[PDB]
Design a protein around this nucleic acid. Structure first.
Ligand SMILES: Nc1ccn([C@@H]2O[C@H](COP(=O)(O)OP(=O)(O)OP(=O)(O)O)[C@@H](O)[C@H]2O)c(=O)n1
Ligand SMILES: [Mg+2]
Ligand SMILES: [Mg+2]
Ligand SMILES: [Zn+2]
Lengths: 49, 49, 99, 277, 79, 1362, 50
DNA sequence: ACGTATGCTATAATGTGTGCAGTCTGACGCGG
């Protein structure tokens, strides 16, 4: 997987909600990971590594 | 590999499930005679004794 | 490849694997259930003990075959005697309760 | 909260005295005279110093938590034997102890085959001599090239390099493919298969029948010498202890038993047949 | 006898108790050196034991009677 | 050495000391140069024993002269090395340490017993917070956690009177103080008060643990280890390599971590070091102990040299790579060899080629044996060399022993029992094994590079077993289906086909022969073709009423070839069987016929002769495969070009905005699907009858002698499906996801694909072959799952003495009867006196087997429905009776007692699924889904008979159906069901209920690519909870502006309108609701997600109009990939997300209370005074409409049925009928043939445990769930003694759970969950007395089944006799 | 030289082998004609035209 | 004497982190 940025979405993390939760992820060549992800209530979160 | 006169037809079930019926003439020409250059080795070690 | 009797494993005390090391063919559990289905009980017990671990059985059976008496002489595979001590080493009382 | 054994301890040292020059002297002066609380403090205080040292003594034998524990033991022996009356600081004196105790404890619990200090100590000088040579030779030094610089034996260098040769675990997967470990390959030395077990049983039962086919005074003397029927394997001269009491007649009768037995192996069908064996 | 073992199963019934009866008889000829009832015609114990069962000479009741008939001869004789 | 049981109990610190023969106090393995143990080290000989057989270390006492002498200097005994793996050790832990298996292996166990959570305990262990052990001053109560701050508060204030400590020390004292006697009574008292579900569950489980703990004799302190056992050094080896290197197990390394830290703690306790350091040391010690027992569990597994984790103890008992599955149930075996197999077309069925140099090594001890007999070898090393030199006379001895000696031939994988068959070895010079063509089917052995393992049966019993059970001749029919698996294919079938098949005149037409010998005479003379119609006088032999054969002589008009084949045909079968052109399917009946008539001998001979003549005539013909043989359609470019413009039309309509994407997606599939069948049939029509140029006078029409066609028509290789790719069209391929590519492959293999046509072919090719590798694991894993639960089932009793059974009805589905009653009730013992129509005389008795000839009289009498004695209806405790099972389909008559069915059943079920992922997965790549079912046409005249139907007449004048599961029967003159269909919801019927129809009439009609929502009342449409943006969307066009509304579901829906249900409410002209006739339900049809609506708000409607159209997108070739997970879910008993509701007890329905649409039901039965309430969703629609006469288990809701819901209400024979139908439905879709009795086996095992409801004479009480056999044995003594009956209610269990439920813990740990099984079994102190096969195969004893059944029962009378 | 099974073809759908066979035969047919002219020791012009 | 072990060095130095972060369906067990 090529370093840079990449936008994905688990087409149904919680098939309970069945909501397509969109997420972004910054992939470096060296360094820590930087992810942004929504949730059932569309609250933006950040999960380093 | 090698090309040769082939004929597609059954033969007393000696070509049952893709089984191959090869002439002795192929074996006579030693055309399907692969060479295996094996390499052995003999080690003189230093044991406790 | 072919094997009658040869090397034996280090702990499992069953034969090794492959023509590389001169090892018998593996008889897995799927291969085992096949004999259970047939009903052939000795053919299986024969392939669990004398042909594999049973240290008493393998040598005893060899001597019996050359005598001509193809006689079943089981004892109990080593690989199980290992499993007993292995569970005891894990702090669990596993003893063989008798008749 | 915190459930890592590492961070928990590293927390508890982070809330422990950080002593000044005259403070160290105040506690240490009472610590030698046995104040109890004093010996506990100087130790509690300088656990933080042990961790900074074990930060460069990791990745060599044991883990970081194992280096700290053995590094703490160095600080304790430093506290057992410090001189407060001397104007020189403690942090200086304690570092010499914490560096030693770690190195020493790594030398023992690093290698599976317990290598004593003496064979190890030497090995290091052979390895650290290899450094100097390697940089200027630009070639990893041979057993000879190391022997030429120290002016020491060839076999010594070589035998010390043999003890450096490390281990592969029996449970290790094989060729980046955990199909089978070394146990599923490596053969059992002790027990040979039925073929070898029955060889001796059949060969030694054949001898029981050959000893009963010979003479009573021939199978008496021959058997008890080799320790076949008797209890101890005696010699030509020692067979005299029983009833023979002879040196010449024991040697003639031993060989007479063997000559009649060599014809018993030529007629049954062995002799030259069982000579290759 | 060599190909078929159905004619042998006809006589006893249980495929499993057939192997046990045939084995026990095969062992008597293999060890005791007992005589085969059917012409052996260069066949191993396996086949011969089946032949005797197939034609109807060997049975669970037959072999148990014959056992204690040799063993009761020994009883009266000893004491 | 011979025992009865195996026990598991908790290792007491005192107990561990009993096994240990010393204390390892040092990590020192060996000295560096002197390769010998160190002083009280990990390889110490003073603890674990001596190195060699009878040799001390220093060398003072040697061999047996000093039998059991203990040395002075080194202090080492002189016994065998035997003891180096038997003798254990121990380590005296400075501070007590917790067991990870009684802490992390859930349930917590240590926490479950204390009534204490995990966090609480762990924070005590890692020294974060103290815990109260016992507070004298009632200020602090027990098991109350105090932070480092809160401990200090109580110390100066209260103190002393409160005892609280920290670490593993504390929790041990907590376990040592707690009273199992008192806290058991306390929990029983709290249970009498107000018990719920969760409260009673928790209490009862703790209660049983507490009683179990006291009766097991275990003490909760042993959860904490004061003593740690050491494994014998030989079981954790330090052995040297050939290369001067050494190698050690990871245990030794993990042990050195434990001992070092433990000894360092001893040192720090000597120094009285500060507690902060002691804490770290104790945390470390626990980390090392937990890492030794189970490394990867509590935290990061301690990695070693090659950055990989150290293999711990638990790991060698854990799962596949553990001792159980890898080094105990599966074994490499002596007298075993494997090699490339090749064909053996000369062999008979009971024969197989075995290389000389293979059989040489294999029969090594048999050569040495026969050699000493002849007197050629005096000893064995003499015999060894005789063999080595390979001298001439040794070959002749080897040849002697092998005669009349069977060998086992195995092929991987071993699916079913036939995966091994025995033969009589034939020595052949060459390294290749030669296998019999007909049994190639059983192994699935293709001569393309296959290898087969050989095994020599040593014991005479194994020689008898191999000849009796495992011989190829004794194994003909499959156990799965009573059908011959031994059957020609390939050349053999084609040869017979060439022979029998006829042609016009030819040489010597219409001639006249004395016999089938004169036919061989004339053909081989060159004055007749095998395809010449000539009258021949053949004398057929037909069996009479007795055993005697009747002879009949007659003139038969066949062909020269057919006549010659009669020579092979035994005399006992009729000639009409070889009078047809013979194919694979026809030939399979010849052998079955031959078997059911004559017997075994005749078939083996027949089988061989068929094979020989098949091959011979197959090579005599000279069939070939040229490029002129693959003839494609003459007007293929005419079909596609205009079928493309067809799809191009809808593509332009979609972008306009009328036909939706989902409707187009289904509509385009139907165009291509028609075109695909159009090319298939036009290519087969121009190929099959391509020989339109004959002679005689001018012309005649005839079957084509196209090479490819003959090879497909005969049923030899390929089919109409394959020829489509060759000359026709390749077809539509499938993506690796599951979706089908919109653009299929147009080209075939002759014409050649262009560059993309091949790129497109790839997509389908790779995904088809991806599911050959990866999906096989799911089907192979199912085989494993099925087997374990069905291990114990063996035929025990002869007659269970029960008169119960399961009413089996003819499986009529898909117009023509899918599975007849005759085949469904074949070889099954009828459990009801079933006579003929006229009830006045018994035709068939009770205890009787239904042979094919008895089933023939069922046809004459036309049986309606039959109560067959089933497996589940068996009363035999621990097994089943031969009557309940019936015939062994493999054999062909009543099953033997002692034969192990369960394993035979599991194999039969898993074998097809697992194989159906390699046969049509490597050669197949073009999906052929033809779901064009749009209208039912009835074929025979009959009266229309609907059942479970509730229809309503529409504006048009047509009976529209408003019920989901509507069935349509076809009743004949006398009054019996001939044809049966599934009419779906919103289907339009031609004629209603009871009306006559003619043959070839469309009785029903509907749209397949749509699921309509149809009304029951007339009036106007109202919009309720259909807010734009929240629940639905809107899209308009132009000039006028026709808008469609599309209902969003929870996926495409916001959080605003989540609790809003969208529905199209019916109203009248005034604006009020319209009641549904004869119910208090205002008319309201709830629309589901993605429901497309064309009528907007304020539109007039009649009854029968379509309100909305739900899309029906289902274009995924189910095959076996997406159909086995459905089988799994059934077996595993997994409730769905839409289970259907059913009535409990029969009574008078009375609708009750409601909760924001959530419907309740206050049912008040006629006899039953106490009401019963159950809740129902809002969006789900019911079937009944309130106030009704409901019976036990009427269908209330529509959807998938929950297996637990079926047995709970409608009993055993209902859940058994469900699983059997449901499973078979999936396998019948694939053409997999399985007898229902095999599924019924697993079903029975799934009904093993049962929850008790009512107190009994035994201390059963409520909440206990015991096995069904054990509780019924208690009921046996109860009906004799009186006392209190133990009423029950049988529960259904999933496969994975049913395996772990058996009392045998050995069977459970051998399966999976091995970490948990053992811990639960240790705490319970359970002793396994061994009944199952897995249990006795492990210990390597006689299997308590099959051959060993006669032996094991003879040991059971040793126990009975005193 | 080798006799293959024609049934290892329809099921397999690898008709390239049959085309390999046909062309190989044609190719050999041409070699057999050239072999004959070189054995007959004909001419440079005759070989050139063919 | 030989091998193994035990000991001290006195500038000051006093809170760690290193390393893979597209498995997946299914099933409970502790808090919240
Ligand atoms: N990954 C694989 C490949 C092959 N096999 C075994 O090898 C057999 C033959 O595989 P293959 O020759 O590729 O398939 P066939 O169905 O024989 O098709 P073909 O006609 O192309 O030979 C399979 O049935 C199976 O027993 C397997 O178990 N796993
Ligand atoms: Mg193959
Ligand atoms: Mg193949
Ligand atoms: Zn000694």
């Amino acid at each position: 997987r090529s370093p840079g940025v990449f936008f994905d979405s688990d087409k149904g993390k919680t098939h309970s909600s069945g909501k397509v939760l969109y997420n972004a992820r910054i992939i470096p060549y060296r360094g820590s990971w930087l992810d942004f992800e929504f949730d059932p209530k569309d609250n933006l979160f950040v999960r380093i590594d | 590999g090698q090309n040769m006169r082939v004929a597609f037809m059954p033969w007393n079930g000696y070509n049952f499930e893709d089984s191959i019926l090869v002439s002795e003439r192929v074996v006579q020409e030693d055309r399907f005679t692969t060479i295996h250059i094996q390499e052995l080795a003999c080690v003189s070690r230093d044991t406790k004794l | 490849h072919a094997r009658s009797t040869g090397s034996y494993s280090l702990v499992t005390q069953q034969p090794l694997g492959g023509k590389a090391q001169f090892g018998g063919q593996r008889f897995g559990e799927m291969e085992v259930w096949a004999l259970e289905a047939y009903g052939a009980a000795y053919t299986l017990q024969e392939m669990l003990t004398v042909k594999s671990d049973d240290v008493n059985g393998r040598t005893k059976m060899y001597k019996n075959i050359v005598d001509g008496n193809h006689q079943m002489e089981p004892g109990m595979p080593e690989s199980f005697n290992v499993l007993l001590k292995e569970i005891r080493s894990l702090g669990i009382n596993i003893e063989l309760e008798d008749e | 909260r915190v459930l890592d054994a590492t961070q928990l301890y590293l927390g508890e040292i982070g809330y422990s005295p950080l002593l000044t020059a005259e403070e160290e002297v105040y506690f240490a002066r009472r610590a030698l005279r046995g104040d109890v609380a004093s010996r506990r403090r100087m130790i509690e205080s300088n656990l933080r110093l042990v961790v900074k040292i074990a930060r460069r003594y990791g990745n060599r034998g044991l883990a970081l938590l194992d280096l700290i524990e053995e590094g703490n033991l160095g600080l304790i022996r430093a506290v057992e034997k410090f001189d407060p009356e001397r104007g020189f600081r403690f942090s200086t004196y304690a570092t010499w102890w914490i560096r030693q105790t770690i190195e020493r404890a790594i030398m023992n619990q690093t290698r599976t085959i317990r290598l004593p200090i003496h064979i190890v100590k030497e090995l290091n000088v052979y390895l650290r001599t290899a450094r100097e040579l390697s940089h200027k030779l630009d070639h990893e030094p041979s057993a000879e090239e190391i022997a030429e610089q120290l002016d020491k034996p060839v076999d010594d260098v070589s035998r010390m390099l043999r003890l450096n040769e490390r281990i592969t675990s029996v449970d290790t997967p094989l060729g980046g493919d955990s199909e089978k470990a070394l146990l599923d390959i490596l053969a059992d030395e002790k027990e040979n298969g039925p073929e070898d077990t029955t060889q001796d049983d059949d060969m030694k039962q054949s001898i029981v029948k050959w000893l009963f086919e010979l003479n009573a005074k021939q199978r008496e003397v021959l058997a008890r010498r080799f320790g076949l029927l008797g209890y101890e394997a005696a010699t030509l001269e020692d067979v005299g202890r029983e009833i023979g009491l002879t040196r010449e007649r024991v040697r003639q009768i031993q060989v007479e038993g063997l000559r009649r037995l060599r014809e018993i192996l030529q007629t049954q069908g062995l002799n030259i047949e069982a000579l290759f064996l | 006898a060599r190909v078929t073992v159905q004619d042998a199963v006809e006589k006893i019934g249980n495929r499993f108790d057939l192997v046990l009866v045939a084995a026990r008889r095969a062992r008597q000829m293999q060890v005791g050196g007992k005589d085969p009832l059917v012409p052996e015609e260069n066949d191993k114990t396996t086949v011969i034991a089946l032949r005797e069962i197939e034609e109807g000479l060997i049975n669970n009741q037959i072999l148990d009677v014959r056992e204690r008939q040799e063993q009761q001869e020994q009883e009266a004789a000893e004491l | 050495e011979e025992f009865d049981a195996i026990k598991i109990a908790l290792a007491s610190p005192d107990m561990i000391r009993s096994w240990s023969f010393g204390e390892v106090k040092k990590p020192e393995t060996i000295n560096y140069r002197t390769f010998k143990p160190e002083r009280d080290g990990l390889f110490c000989a003073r603890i674990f024993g001596p190195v060699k057989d009878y040799e001390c270390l220093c060398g003072k006492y040697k061999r047996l002269k000093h039998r059991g002498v203990i040395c002075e200097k080194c202090g080492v005994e002189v016994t065998q090395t035997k003891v180096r793996r038997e003798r254990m050790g121990h380590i005296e832990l400075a501070s007590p340490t917790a067991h990870i298996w009684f802490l992390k292996s859930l349930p917590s166990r240590i926490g479950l017993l204390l009534d204490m959570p995990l966090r609480d305990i762990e924070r005590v262990l890692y020294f974060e917070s103290y815990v109260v052990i016992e507070g004298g001053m009632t200020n602090l109560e027990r098991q109350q956690i105090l932070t480092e701050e809160q401990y200090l508060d109580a110390l100066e204030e209260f103190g002393d009177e409160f005892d609280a400590k920290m670490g593993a020390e504390a929790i041990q004292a907590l376990l040592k103080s707690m009273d199992l006697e008192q806290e058991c009574e306390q929990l029983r008292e709290e249970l009498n008060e107000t018990n719920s579900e969760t409260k009673r569950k928790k209490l009862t489980k703790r209660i049983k643990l507490l009683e179990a703990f006291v009766q097991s004799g275990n003490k909760p302190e042993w959860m904490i280890l004061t003593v740690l056992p050491v494994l014998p050094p030989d079981l954790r080896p330090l052995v040297p390599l050939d290369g001067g290197r050494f190698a050690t197990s990871d245990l030794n390394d993990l042990y050195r971590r434990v001992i070092n830290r433990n000894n360092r703690l001893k040192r720090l306790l000597d120094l009285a070091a500060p507690d902060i350091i002691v804490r770290n040391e104790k945390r470390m010690l626990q980390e090392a102990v937990d890492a030794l027992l189970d490394n990867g569990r509590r935290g990061r597994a301690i990695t070693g040299s090659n950055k990989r984790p150290l293999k711990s103890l638990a790991d060698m008992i854990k799962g596949k790579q553990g001792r159980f599955r890898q080094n105990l149930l599966g074994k490499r075996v002596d007298y075993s060899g494997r090699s490339v197999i090749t064909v053996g077309p000369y062999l008979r069925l009971h024969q197989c080629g075995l290389p000389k140099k293979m059989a040489l090594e294999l029969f090594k001890p048999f050569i040495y044996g026969k050699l000493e007999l002849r007197g050629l070898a005096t000893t064995i090393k003499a015999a060894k060399k005789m063999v080595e030199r390979e001298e001439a006379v040794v070959w002749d001895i080897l040849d002697e022993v092998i005669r009349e000696h069977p060998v086992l031939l195995n092929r991987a994988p071993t699916l079913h029992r036939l995966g091994i068959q025995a033969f009589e070895p034939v020595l052949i010079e060459g390294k290749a094994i030669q296998l019999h063509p007909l049994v190639c089917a059983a192994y699935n052995a293709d001569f393309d590079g296959d290898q087969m393992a050989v095994h020599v049966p040593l014991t005479l019993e194994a020689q008898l077993e191999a000849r009796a059970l495992m011989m190829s001749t004794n194994n003909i029919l499959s156990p799965a289906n009573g059908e011959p698996i031994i059957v020609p294919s390939q050349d053999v079938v084609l040869g017979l086909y060439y022979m029998t098949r006829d042609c016009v005149n030819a040489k010597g037409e219409g001639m006249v022969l004395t016999g089938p010998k004169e036919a061989e005479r004339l053909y081989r003379s060159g004055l007749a073709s095998l395809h010449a119609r000539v009258k021949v006088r053949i004398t057929e032999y037909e069996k009479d009423a007795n055993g005697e054969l009747v002879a009949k002589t007659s003139l038969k008009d066949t062909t020269v070839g057919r006549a010659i084949l009669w020579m092979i045909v035994p005399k006992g079968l009729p000639y009409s069987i070889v009078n047809q052109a013979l194919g694979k399917k026809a030939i399979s009946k010849m052998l079955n016929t031959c078997y059911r008539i004559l017997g075994l001998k005749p078939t083996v001979i027949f089988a061989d002769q068929i094979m020989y003549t098949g091959f011979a005539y197959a090579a005599r013909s000279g069939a070939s495969v040229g490029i002129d043989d693959m003839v494609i359609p003459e007007k293929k470019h005419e079909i596609i070009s205009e079928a493309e413009a067809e799809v191009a039309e809808i593509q332009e309509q979609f972008q306009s905005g009328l036909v939706t994407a989902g409707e187009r997606y289904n509509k385009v599939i139907d165009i291509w699907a028609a075109a695909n069948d159009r090319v298939s049939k036009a290519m087969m029509d121009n190929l099959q009858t391509e020989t339109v140029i004959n002679r005689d006078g001018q012309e005649e029409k005839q079957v084509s002698f196209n090479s490819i066609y003959m090879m497909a028509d005969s049923g030899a290789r390929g089919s109409a499906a394959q020829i489509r790719q060759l000359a026709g069209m390749r077809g539509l391929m499938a993506k690796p996801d599951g979706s089908i590519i919109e653009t299929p492959i147009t080209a075939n293999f002759r014409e050649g694909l262009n560059v993309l046509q091949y790129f497109i072919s790839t997509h389908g090719a790779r995904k088809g072959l991806a599911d050959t590798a990866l999906k096989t694991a799911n089907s192979g894993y199912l085989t494993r799952r099925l087997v374990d639960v069905a291990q114990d089932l063996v035929v025990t009793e002869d007659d269970c003495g029960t008169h119960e059974g399961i009413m089996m009805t003819p499986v009529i589905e898909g117009g023509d009867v899918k599975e007849p009653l005759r085949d469904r009730v074949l070889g099954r013992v009828t459990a009801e006196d079933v006579l003929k129509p006229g009830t006045a005389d018994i035709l068939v008795p009770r205890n009787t087997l239904l042979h094919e000839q008895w089933c023939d009289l069922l046809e004459e009498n036309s049986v309606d429905a039959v109560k067959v004695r089933s497996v589940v209806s068996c009363d035999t405790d621990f097994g089943v009776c031969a009557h309940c099972y019936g015939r062994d389909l493999a054999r062909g008559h009543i099953i033997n007692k002692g034969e192990a069915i369960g394993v035979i059943a599991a194999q039969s079920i898993g074998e097809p699924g697992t194989q159906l992922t390699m046969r049509t997965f490597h050669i197949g790549g073009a999906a052929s889904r033809a779901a064009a079912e749009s209208s039912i046409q009835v074929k025979n005249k009959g009266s229309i008979k609907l059942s479970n139907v509730k229809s309503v007449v529409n504006s048009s004048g047509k009976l529209v159906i408003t019920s989901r599961n509507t069935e349509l029967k076809l009743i004949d003159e006398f009054g019996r069901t001939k044809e049966s269909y599934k009419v779906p919801y919103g289907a339009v019927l031609a004629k209603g209920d009871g009306e006559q129809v003619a043959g070839g009439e469309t009785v029903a009609n509907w749209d397949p690519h749509t699921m309509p929502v149809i009304t029951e009342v007339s009036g106007f449409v109202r919009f309720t909870d259909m807010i734009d943006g929240q629940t639905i969307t809107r899209q308009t066009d132009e000039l006028t502006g026709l808008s469609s509304l599309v209902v969003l579901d929870s996926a495409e829906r916001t959080a605003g309108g989540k609790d809003l249900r969208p529905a199209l409410k019916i109203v009248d002209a005034q604006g009020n609701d319209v009641l549904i006739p004869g119910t208090d339900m205002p008319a309201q049809y709830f629309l589901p997600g993605k429901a497309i609506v064309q009528l907007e708000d304020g539109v007039q409607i009649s009854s029968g109009d379509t309100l909305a159209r739900i899309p029906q997108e289902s274009g995924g070739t189910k095959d076996i990939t997406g159909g086995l997970p459905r089988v799994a879910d059934l077996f595993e008993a997994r409730r769905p997300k839409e289970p259907a509701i059913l009535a409990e007890i029969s009574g008078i329905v009375s609708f009750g209370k409601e909760t924001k649409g959530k419907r309740r039901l206050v049912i008040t039965p006629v006899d039953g005074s106490d009401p019963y309430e159950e809740m129902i969703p809002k969006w789900r629609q019911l079937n009944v409409f309130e106030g009704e006469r409901v019976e036990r288990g009427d269908v209330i809701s529509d959807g998938p049925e929950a297996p637990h819901d079926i047995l709970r209400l409608r009993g055993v024979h209902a859940v058994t009928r469900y699983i059997v139908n449901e499973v078979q439905d999936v396998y019948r879709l694939q053409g997999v043939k399985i007898n229902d009795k095999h599924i019924e086996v697993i079903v029975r095992q799934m009904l093993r445990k049962a929850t008790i409801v009512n107190a009994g004479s035994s201390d059963f009480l409520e909440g206990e769930q015991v096995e069904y056999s054990r509780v019924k044995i208690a009921n046996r003594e109860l009906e004799a003694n009186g006392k209190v009956g133990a009423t029950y209610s049988r529960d259904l269990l999933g496969i994975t759970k049913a395996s772990l439920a058996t009392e045998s813990f050995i069977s459970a740990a051998s399966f999976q969950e091995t970490t948990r099984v053992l811990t639960e079994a240790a705490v319970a102190g359970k002793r396994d007395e061994l009944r199952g096969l897995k249990e006795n195969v492990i210990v390597g004893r006689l299997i308590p089944a099959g051959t060993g059944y006669a032996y094991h029962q003879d040991r059971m009378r040793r126990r009975a006799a005193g | 030289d080798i006799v293959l099974n024609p049934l290892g073809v329809p099921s397999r759908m690898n008709i390239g082998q049959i085309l390999e066979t046909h062309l190989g035969m044609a190719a050999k047919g041409i070699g057999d004609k050239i072999n004959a002219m070189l054995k007959q020791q004909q001419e440079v012009a005759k070989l050139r035209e063919f």
